[PDB]
Amino acid sequence: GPALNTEKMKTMLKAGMTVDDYAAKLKLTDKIAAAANSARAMEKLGETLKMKKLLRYLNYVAEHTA
Amino acid sequence: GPALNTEKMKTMLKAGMTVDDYAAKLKLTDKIAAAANSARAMEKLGETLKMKKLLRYLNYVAEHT
Numbered sequence A: 001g002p003a004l005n006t007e008k009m010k011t012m013l014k015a016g017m018t019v020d021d022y023a024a025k026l027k028l029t030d031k032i033a034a035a036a037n038s039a040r041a042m043e044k045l046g047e048t049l050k051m052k053k054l055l056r057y058l059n060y061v062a063e064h065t066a
Numbered sequence B: 001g002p003a004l005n006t007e008k009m010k011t012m013l014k015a016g017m018t019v020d021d022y023a024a025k026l027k028l029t030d031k032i033a034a035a036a037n038s039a040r041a042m043e044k045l046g047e048t049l050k051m052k053k054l055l056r057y058l059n060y061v062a063e064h065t
């Protein structure tokens, strides 16, 4: 995506940013905690640009492991 | 049960399981990719116990070492 691409994620991973670190940068950590418990909070979080970016980064880091 | 608890999460963190490692263990990464352009698919994915466990672990790792 325009705001978080391939090359930007490579820079984040070189910096040692974990998925959880990036969620904190996004100010999403507490919302994620609420989403694990509440279907309403989950559905709301799932519609966000911030969660889209977070999940993008998560798959990127997994593909660069092992 | 399949749902997480804090002792399970402590064990995972001691073993060095990262959040993305846990997504891979749950076989969620393909599903995450697939749901990125569908509201419905994302909603369905968020309704799964697997996704809820992943998000619980993400917050756990954020608050623990």
Ligand SMILES: [Br-]
Binding pocket: A001, A002, A003, A004, A053
């Ligand atoms: Br983006």
Ligand SMILES: [Br-]
Binding pocket: A003, A004, A053
């Ligand atoms: Br960003």
Ligand SMILES: [Br-]
Binding pocket: A031, A044, A045, A048
């Ligand atoms: Br939200």
Ligand SMILES: [Br-]
Binding pocket: A049, A050
């Ligand atoms: Br944003």
Ligand SMILES: [Br-]
Binding pocket: A018, B018
């Ligand atoms: Br780590």
Ligand SMILES: [Br-]
Binding pocket: B031, B044, B045, B048
């Ligand atoms: Br699903």
Ligand SMILES: [Br-]
Binding pocket: B003, B004, B052, B053, B056
């Ligand atoms: Br859970």
